Write an enzyme that holds these catalytic residues in place. Structure first.
Site, mmCIF file in Angstrom:
data_model
loop_
_atom_site.group_PDB
_atom_site.id
_atom_site.type_symbol
_atom_site.label_atom_id
_atom_site.label_comp_id
_atom_site.label_asym_id
_atom_site.label_seq_id
_atom_site.Cartn_x
_atom_site.Cartn_y
_atom_site.Cartn_z
ATOM 1 N N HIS A 66 -2.734 -4.646 2.577
ATOM 2 C CA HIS A 66 -3.958 -4.092 3.154
ATOM 3 C C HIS A 66 -3.963 -4.154 4.680
ATOM 4 C CE1 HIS A 66 -8.037 -2.901 3.699
ATOM 5 N NE2 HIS A 66 -8.523 -4.115 3.888
ATOM 6 N N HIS A 94 -1.110 4.460 -0.225
ATOM 7 C CA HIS A 94 -2.138 5.261 0.444
ATOM 8 C C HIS A 94 -1.867 6.760 0.327
ATOM 9 C CE1 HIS A 94 -5.173 2.653 2.047
ATOM 10 N NE2 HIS A 94 -4.282 1.835 2.575
ATOM 11 N N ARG A 152 -13.632 -5.881 10.044
ATOM 12 C CA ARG A 152 -13.688 -4.776 9.096
ATOM 13 C C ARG A 152 -15.097 -4.482 8.602
ATOM 14 N NH1 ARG A 152 -8.677 -3.050 6.792
ATOM 15 N NH2 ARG A 152 -6.946 -4.434 7.363
ATOM 16 N N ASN A 194 -9.072 -2.133 -1.802
ATOM 17 C CA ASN A 194 -10.376 -1.896 -1.196
ATOM 18 C C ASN A 194 -10.752 -0.423 -1.199
ATOM 19 O OD1 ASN A 194 -8.383 -1.411 1.006
ATOM 20 N ND2 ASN A 194 -10.236 -1.072 2.221
ATOM 21 N N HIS A 195 -9.779 0.472 -1.323
ATOM 22 C CA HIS A 195 -10.036 1.904 -1.334
ATOM 23 C C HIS A 195 -10.304 2.448 -2.730
ATOM 24 C CE1 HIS A 195 -9.096 3.507 2.816
ATOM 25 N NE2 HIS A 195 -8.852 2.216 2.943
ATOM 26 N N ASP A 218 -6.399 7.847 -0.480
ATOM 27 C CA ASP A 218 -6.948 7.944 0.872
ATOM 28 C C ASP A 218 -5.855 8.005 1.931
ATOM 29 O OD1 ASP A 218 -9.650 8.007 0.145
ATOM 30 O OD2 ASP A 218 -9.798 5.816 0.133
ATOM 31 N N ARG A 219 -6.124 8.725 3.021
ATOM 32 C CA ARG A 219 -5.214 8.809 4.164
ATOM 33 C C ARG A 219 -3.834 9.311 3.749
ATOM 34 N NH1 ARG A 219 -7.201 5.777 8.447
ATOM 35 N NH2 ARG A 219 -9.013 4.463 7.975
ATOM 36 N N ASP A 250 -4.752 0.297 -3.158
ATOM 37 C CA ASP A 250 -4.735 1.330 -2.123
ATOM 38 C C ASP A 250 -3.728 2.432 -2.456
ATOM 39 O OD1 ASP A 250 -6.721 0.049 -0.756
ATOM 40 O OD2 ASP A 250 -5.643 -0.046 1.155
ATOM 41 N N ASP A 257 0.830 -1.194 0.000
ATOM 42 C CA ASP A 257 0.000 0.000 0.000
ATOM 43 C C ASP A 257 0.869 1.250 0.000
ATOM 44 O OD1 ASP A 257 -2.359 -1.453 0.067
ATOM 45 O OD2 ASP A 257 -2.357 -1.546 2.257
ATOM 46 N N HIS A 313 -5.006 -8.020 -3.030
ATOM 47 C CA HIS A 313 -5.071 -7.055 -1.939
ATOM 48 C C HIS A 313 -5.563 -7.697 -0.648
ATOM 49 C CE1 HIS A 313 -4.835 -2.912 -0.607
ATOM 50 N NE2 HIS A 313 -6.025 -3.020 -0.047
HETATM 51 FE FE LIG Z 1 -6.444 -1.830 1.584
HETATM 52 ZN ZN LIG Z 2 -4.955 -0.021 3.019
#
Ligand SMILES: [Fe+2]
Ligand SMILES: [Zn+2]
Lengths: 13, 431, 581, 308
Positions: free
Chosen positions: D240, D58, D213, D116-117, D87-88, D84, D56, D166
């Site tokens: 992930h 991110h 999750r 997943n993002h 995000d963040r 990923d 990741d 992932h």
């Molecule tokens: Fe992820």
């Molecule tokens: Zn992640």
């Protein structure tokens, strides 16, 4: 006391 | 003898609808005293200006703006509240006014200025009513300035953000007109008023192992005159005075003010009620007032082992400590303030009561901020709480949802601002 | 065509910040098109008090107003620029105020003395006596431009106004006065400097605010440069002595940071009598910042001492403090001392360097902090001319080896960047015997940045040591990496060949490096193949055209038939660039 | 012409390399051509060794530059990212734009999967939409990027022996043919094999389980061993999950989790890692620390110049 007002200091994701 | 306080004004809703967003969270006068700013839980700041024709004029709405907006910390996936924690006025540089407003994470510098003229005249069109054909103009006309009705503007000049890991609880300007400090639960950072991309972390008491946490910083303040001296109080009931001349980092305190722990009045709540919720320097700078849950302590800055004065705000809550612990009222953070001449100190209490203590005469009075006395120039009757004689109030009938946490004194005159849950009361003396 | 200038004029009212900024940056065109009288009577009143508060727009306007002397009608009407600038000198933004003050100073020179006394001096008096301390802060910087060209009465008035500013209530005005005190005293008469500048300097140096007191050190430097030597003891020296022992660490830091300027200003006798103990006390200060600042000044301070007793002062008074500074607790103090202690060798001489400075060099070379060791290594030039580097080789080799194999790859990169200097100083034989293995082992590091840095280091080493040493020593070693079972190291071989071909020579490139570049064109990994194509593209100009037409062209043609799209594209690019097809 | 577009794409790559965004039209064209490229890629992409597998990022652009410094620059190094990319992070837009540009320019040299993002809901909640709106003033860029994210392959297969994805395994997934039979050209579901492959996690509890999750299921060592035996896979590379040491083995050297975001969320203080697979499937992990920087607030215990 370290729980009610503190909270966010000790709380870590 | 006692000052004859009288009802002057009330600002807010006439109902009990708090709405949870109109709740006042800070009250502050400016250095001249003609401006009074209040921030609320919704992130709004409202500034009232005294009507100028000593000066006993009324306060009317002068400006209103949205200081802070609700945010989301994606880095921690947490809601960041827009509630205004502290407002601090800067000394007047020019015709405009400046203030610092802080939420839990971000400090903002706001400039409030008046505009009374607008540009007039156009070349390629009329006054936004219609456009003009090209090549029709053969004579330039520079726009002129024409007077307009006075309107007040508020704009954010600088943003000091992303520097505090925990929730900011204090901001304090320095006497050098240059810097200021911001203090969260575990660190105190020093900012320059014109630099936003870096801050100097002067104090850091965060332990290496977070399960060994024993203290947090609850308030911090610069000395009114000395540019090198500041103080910060902790949840253990101790105040550390730091001198910035000794070293660059103030991790070693110059003085430590703490009273010996009395073994007489020991209780399960003695650790909670000993936490200091506010520390204020006297105007002369020779004294220091701290507020804990049950008492107000006045310290001479030359004597560290004990305070010179101690006033009991509400002693009838000492036997009701368990009840106040069940409903989380024991964690309220009341404040305190001096008068212009450092002779009277004002603090808040429950059931819309606030307390005045006279240092010279050692006389205390309890007054109520209620709308039932909505008549200007009406003397407020002193209140007495009975642990029931005539005109007394029983302890069990007090409303603990009505707390006066925020109060302000007029820097020169006998004018006080008292913030209840939803209304702001302005009181003056009989003159 | 007055349409564009009408657009420019109307853009001054636009709500867009960028449009107003662009129109402000082009006020010269608007003023030129309007004329002279029109600019004076129409544009300037509009620019006098602008409603917009953008810092960049105000800064651009302040810059522009300083060059309108010709556009307003020459020096005769230059005073018409005073109002628009004066307002800009009152705003809350420090940079805008400074730009307005600079423009006011720039346009003051166009004023005739009559206009100076009639329009500029009243402006300075209004700013200095203003109710807002931004105006008073701006007024401090305008005294020296108008003082020399006015009458004696106006000079006395200006001196009184500056004295009033030096005693202002707000700390910012006092800070501005302290900042401008030196440049103001530079233009006063010597008698008035002794009579009036000295009391203000003494009062400001004993201010309550630390930020004002620390500004008195530069004023001390400036004032000491004006007075004769015999007056320094009576007037300047007590203030400097008080400043060196100040309670605030910021004042002491300012003293230590400007110690060489003070040394030059006061002279040699005062330096020996007064400044040497002050430097000793600063090097033993309780604040790490002050100690680091004093450590930065060791070499310059020792160098400028009077040659009659320079060595005695250094060996008997400065050296013992340096010995304790070597073992300091603070990292930055040790780094600052290491960056300059190397330069005391020429001053002391060979015997003193061997007896006294050499143990300190060894101790700082064995320090735990990588930065201290790097600072010591980076400054071997001074010592190399006093004692041969062959005496320091057996002590430098372990330090270089330790730095070259550090866990942190940025430390390895830092020691790589200094390798050519060390190789040049230590000689060819020492590098071939000892340092060659480190350079060769850098090329096979896990981190790609280290491999690239080592490749550039190989280029510089070739440039320094000539073609023959590279041919005899490193080339057979870089070619051996072609057989590595990892494709990254094969591309490292290709990159080394690419960087070497520039300097190593045409004949050697054709005879030795080329046989391997063409041989790796059949590499199974497509990355190696299109890197071979890029290598042939880069080293093509070095080779003779016959070689390109003989062996390079068929190889590129074969690579243009590869399955991989990248190989084909890069082979086509190489063919087009070299014009082989 | 192809050459003009290639030169423009190159210039876009160097422009992005100093962390500055592109125009709306440039982003739209890049996303359209990336979709044109990705619509042909299989659900289980065939990746050829040697290759550097990355975890990741991110939206940490500077840590992505540090990763490129550690492992080499594309197209010289063959990469394989496992989702990923947003995000963040302070620079999710720049990171995803650079990765998409590299994929378009060097489609045979870099393979990017779906994390997943890479969803319209997740990006809006966790700051990608907020960042793009702040940097552009409209939602066109977010719309284009979320449209592109649908085409990203779900999984990758390296030398027919290493499975890269992932999240992890799914109960409704038993053969790579099942993965190839799914429809990935859609928003990530809240349930099903496609959501499981991006939300599942390894665990020490035997058999399947419930993931805290809110999506996907947790599998034990037995599940991973059975999947490897059935599909003939030597190892399952996965991402992930934040790991402090950068890379972590689990399920008896059958699952390896790789995280390539050092100092996760600028606060975790973890290490990042990348797994280099050599010409003969010889794995080696390179661990790296955050790239030196100051941050937007430079909060330090060293005295700044204004106070000095
Ligand atoms: Fe992820
Ligand atoms: Zn992640």
């Amino acid at each position: 006391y370290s729980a009610k007002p503190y909270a966010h200091i000790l709380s870590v994701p | 003898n006692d000052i004859q306080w009288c009802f002057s004004q009330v600002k807010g809703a006439v109902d009990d609808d708090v709405a949870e967003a109109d709740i006042i969270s800070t009250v502050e006068f400016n250095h001249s005293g003609e401006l009074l700013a209040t921030g609320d839980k919704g992130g709004r700041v409202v500034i009232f200006q005294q009507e100028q024709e000593h000066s006993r004029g009324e306060y009317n709405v002068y400006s209103t703006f949205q200081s802070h907006e609700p945010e989301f910390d994606y880095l921690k996936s947490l809601e960041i509240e827009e509630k205004i924690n502290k407002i601090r006025w800067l000394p007047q540089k020019n015709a405009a006014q400046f203030l610092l407003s802080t939420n839990d994470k971000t400090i903002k510098l706001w400039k409030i200025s008046e505009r009374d003229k607008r540009p007039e005249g156009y070349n390629l069109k009329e006054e936004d009513g219609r456009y003009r054909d090209p090549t029709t103009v053969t004579t330039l006309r520079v726009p002129v300035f024409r007077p307009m009705d006075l309107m007040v503007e508020a704009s954010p000049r600088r943003i000091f953000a992303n520097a505090h890991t925990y929730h900011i609880n204090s901001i304090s300007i320095n006497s050098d007109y240059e810097t200021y400090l911001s203090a969260d639960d575990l660190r105190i950072n020093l900012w320059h008023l014109e630099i936003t991309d870096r801050s100097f972390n002067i104090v850091d008491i965060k332990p290496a192992n977070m399960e060994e946490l024993t203290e947090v910083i609850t308030a911090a303040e610069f000395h009114p005159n000395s540019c090198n001296t500041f103080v910060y109080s902790s949840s253990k009931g101790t105040i550390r005075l730091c001198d910035m001349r000794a070293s660059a980092l103030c991790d070693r305190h110059s003085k430590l003010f703490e009273e010996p722990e009395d073994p007489s009045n020991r209780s399960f709540f003695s650790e909670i009620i000993s936490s200091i919720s506010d520390v204020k320097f006297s105007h002369s700078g020779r004294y220091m007032m701290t507020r804990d849950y049950l008492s107000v302590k006045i310290w001479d800055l030359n004597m560290e082992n004990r305070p010179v004065e101690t006033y009991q705000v509400h002693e009838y809550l000492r036997s009701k400590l368990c009840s106040l612990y069940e409903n989380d009222c024991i964690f309220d953070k009341f404040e305190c303030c001096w008068n212009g001449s450092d002779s009277v100190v004002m603090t808040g209490s429950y059931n819309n009561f606030f307390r005045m203590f006279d240092r010279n005469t050692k006389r205390d009075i309890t007054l109520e901020a209620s709308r039932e006395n909505n008549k200007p120039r009406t003397v407020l009757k002193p209140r007495k709480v009975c642990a029931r004689k005539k005109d007394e109030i029983s302890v069990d009938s007090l409303d603990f949802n009505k707390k006066i946490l925020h109060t302000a004194w007029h820097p020169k005159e006998n004018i006080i601002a008292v913030a209840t849950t939803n209304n702001l009361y302005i009181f003056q003396d009989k003159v | 065509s007055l349409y564009p200038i009408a657009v420019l004029i109307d853009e001054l009212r636009n709500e867009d910040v960028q449009l107003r900024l662009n129109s402000i940056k082009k006020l010269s065109t608007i003023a030129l098109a309007l004329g002279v009288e029109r600019t004076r009577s129409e544009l300037l009143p509009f620019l006098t008090d602008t409603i917009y508060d953008e810092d960049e727009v105000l800064l651009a306007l302040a810059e522009q107003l300083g060059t309108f002397t010709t556009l307003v009608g020459g020096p005769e009407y230059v005073h018409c620029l005073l109002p628009p600038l004066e307002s800009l000198a009152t705003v809350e933004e420090t940079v805008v105020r400074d730009k307005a003050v600079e423009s006011l100073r720039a346009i003051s020179h166009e004023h005739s003395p009559s206009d100076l006394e009639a329009h500029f001096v009243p402006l300075v008096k209004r700013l200095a006596g203003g109710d807002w301390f931004t105006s008073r802060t701006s007024a401090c910087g305008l005294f020296s431009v108008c003082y020399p060209r006015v009458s004696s009465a106006v000079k006395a008035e200006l001196r009184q106004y500056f004295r009033n500013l030096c005693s202002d209530d707000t700390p910012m005005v006092r800070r501005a006065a302290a900042s401008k005190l030196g440049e103001f005293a530079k233009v006063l008469e010597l008698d008035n400097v002794k009579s009036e500048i000295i009391p203000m300097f003494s009062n400001l140096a004993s201010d309550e605010q630390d930020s004002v007191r620390l500004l008195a050190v530069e004023a001390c430097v400036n004032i000491a440069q004006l007075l004769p030597q015999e007056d320094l003891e009576a007037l300047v020296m007590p203030t400097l002595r008080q400043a060196a022992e100040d309670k605030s660490w910021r004042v002491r830091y300012m003293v230590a940071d400007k110690f060489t300027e003070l040394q030059k200003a006061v002279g040699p006798e005062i330096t020996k009598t007064d400044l040497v103990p002050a430097f000793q006390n600063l090097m033993k200060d309780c604040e790490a910042e002050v100690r680091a600042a004093a450590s930065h000044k060791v070499k310059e301070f020792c160098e400028n001492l009077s040659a009659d007793c320079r060595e005695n002062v250094i060996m008997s008074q400065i050296l013992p403090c340096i010995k304790e500074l070597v073992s300091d607790a603070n990292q930055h103090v040790k780094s600052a001392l290491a960056s300059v202690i190397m330069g005391l060798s020429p001053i002391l001489g060979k015997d003193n360097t061997i007896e006294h400075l050499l143990p300190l060099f060894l101790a700082q070379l064995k320090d735990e902090c990588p930065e201290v060791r790097l600072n010591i290594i980076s400054n071997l030039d001074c010592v190399n001319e006093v004692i041969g580097i062959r005496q320091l080789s057996q002590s430098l080799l372990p330090a270089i080896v330790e730095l070259a194999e550090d866990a942190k790859w940025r430390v390895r990169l830092a020691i790589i960047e200094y390798m050519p200097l060390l190789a040049g100083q230590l000689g060819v034989e020492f590098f071939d015997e000892k340092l060659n293995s480190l350079c060769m082992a850098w090329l096979v590091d896990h981190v790609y940045a280290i491999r690239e840095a080592a490749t550039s280091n190989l280029k510089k080493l070739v440039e320094k040591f000539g073609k023959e040493w590279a041919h005899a020593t490193i080339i057979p070693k870089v070619l051996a990496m072609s057989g590595d079972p990892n494709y990254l190291h094969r591309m490292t071989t290709l990159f080394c060949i690419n960087v070497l071909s520039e300097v190593c020579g045409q004949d050697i490139t054709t005879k030795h490096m080329l046989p391997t570049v063409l041989r790796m064109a059949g590499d199974p990994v497509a990355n190696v193949r299109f890197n071979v194509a890029k290598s042939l593209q880069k080293i093509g100009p070095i080779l003779d055209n016959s070689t390109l037409q003989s062996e390079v062209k068929p190889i590129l043609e074969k690579l243009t038939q590869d399955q991989d799209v990248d190989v084909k594209y890069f082979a086509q690019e190489a063919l087009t660039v070299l014009s082989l097809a | 012409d192809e050459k003009v577009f290639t030169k423009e794409l190159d210039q876009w790559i160097e422009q992005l390399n100093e962390c500055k965004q592109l125009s709306e039209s440039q982003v739209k064209s890049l996303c359209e051509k990336a979709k044109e490229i990705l619509t042909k890629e299989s659900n289980v992409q065939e990746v050829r060794c040697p290759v550097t597998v990355c975890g990741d990022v991110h939206g940490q652009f500077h840590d992505l530059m540090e990763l490129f410094r550690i492992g080499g620059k594309s197209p010289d190094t063959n990469y394989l990212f496992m989702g990923d990319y947003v995000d963040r992070g302070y620079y999710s837009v720049e990171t995803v734009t650079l990765l998409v540009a590299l994929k378009v320019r060097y489609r045979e040299r870099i393979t990017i999967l779906r994390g997943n993002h890479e969803s319209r809901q997740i990006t809006q909640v966790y700051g990608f939409y907020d960042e793009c709106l702040r940097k552009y003033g409209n939602a066109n860029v977010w719309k284009y990027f979320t449209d592109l994210f649908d085409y990203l392959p779900l999984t990758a297969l390296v030398d027919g022996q290493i499975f890269c994805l992932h999240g992890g395994l799914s109960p409704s997934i038993d053969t790579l043919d099942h993965i190839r039979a799914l429809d990935r050209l859609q928003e990530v579901p809240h349930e099903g094999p496609m959501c499981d492959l991006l939300w599942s996690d390894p665990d020490d509890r035997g058999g399947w389980g419930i993931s805290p999750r809110g999506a996907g299921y947790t599998f034990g060592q037995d599940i991973s061993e059975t999947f490897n035996h059935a599909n003939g896979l030597t190892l399952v590379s996965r991402a992930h999950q934040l790991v402090m040491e950068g890379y972590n083995w689990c399920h008896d050297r059958n699952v390896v989790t790789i995280f390539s975001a050092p100092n996760y969320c600028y606060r975790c203080g973890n290490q990042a890692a990348i797994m280099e697979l050599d010409d003969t499937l010889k794995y080696s992990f390179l661990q790296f620390d955050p790239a030196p920087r100051r941050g937007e607030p430079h909060v330090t215990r060293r005295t700044p110049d204004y106070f000095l």
